[model samples]
Target: GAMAKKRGIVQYDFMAESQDELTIKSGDKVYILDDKKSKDWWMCQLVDSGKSGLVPAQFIEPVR
Candidate 1:
């Protein structure tokens, strides 16, 4: 299991059907994985399932 180094919250539902991609519902808690390396997207994990993937940064709110 990976420790949550950072956190975020999903603002909208995102559907990612491809392998290694993530799907999240509105208000879902996400754990940041890459420390926000990208401007458009971020590597993160779904808090409940620990499912890792990249999600649009605009769809989530980062926790300071």
Candidate 2:
């Protein structure tokens, strides 16, 4: 079963490519980075298999 959540708008960092293959589930609260750094990517606290990884800033959307 898929859980329903809110979707937002997000743009890739100026350093990221437009075609970067990235995606995140509905309710994943990742570590939003303030600058360009691979260490500070998005992540999910809970997933089927212990969610926690580097999610590119370009893949995140702004929450309103």
Candidate 3:
């Protein structure tokens, strides 16, 4: 069995150059897939693209 998926909300518009990085905008709900892999960067997926990518941890707020 796998752990339940975590959710997060974007706080601001962000776009940067990085490998496997995903762009995020304010108020976009994202799925937190890998939160323990990095300290500042986290793996998340959006429903629009349905792909996993790295996002800045500070740019998102955890949601219940």
Top model number, TM-score = 3
TM-score (C-alpha) between model 2 and the true structure: 0.28
Model 2 poorest ten-residue lDDT run: 13-22
Task: TM-score each candidate.
Answer: 0.79, 0.28, 0.85
Global lDDT of each model?
0.83, 0.42, 0.85
* Deviation in Å, model 1, residue 52 alpha carbon: 1.0
lDDT-based ranking: 3, 1, 2
* Per-structure clash totals for the candidates: 0, 2, 0
Q: By the TM-score metric, which is better: model 1 or model 2? A: 1
TM-score of 1: 0.79
- The C-alpha RMSD of each candidate to the native structure, in angstroms, is 3.2, 9.7, 1.5
**Model 1 per-residue lDDT tens digits across residues 1-64:** 5663687899989898777568989999988887547788788799999888988888889885
Model 2 regions more than 4 Å off = 1-40, 43-50
Which segments of candidate 1 are over 4 A away from where they belong? Answer: 1-4
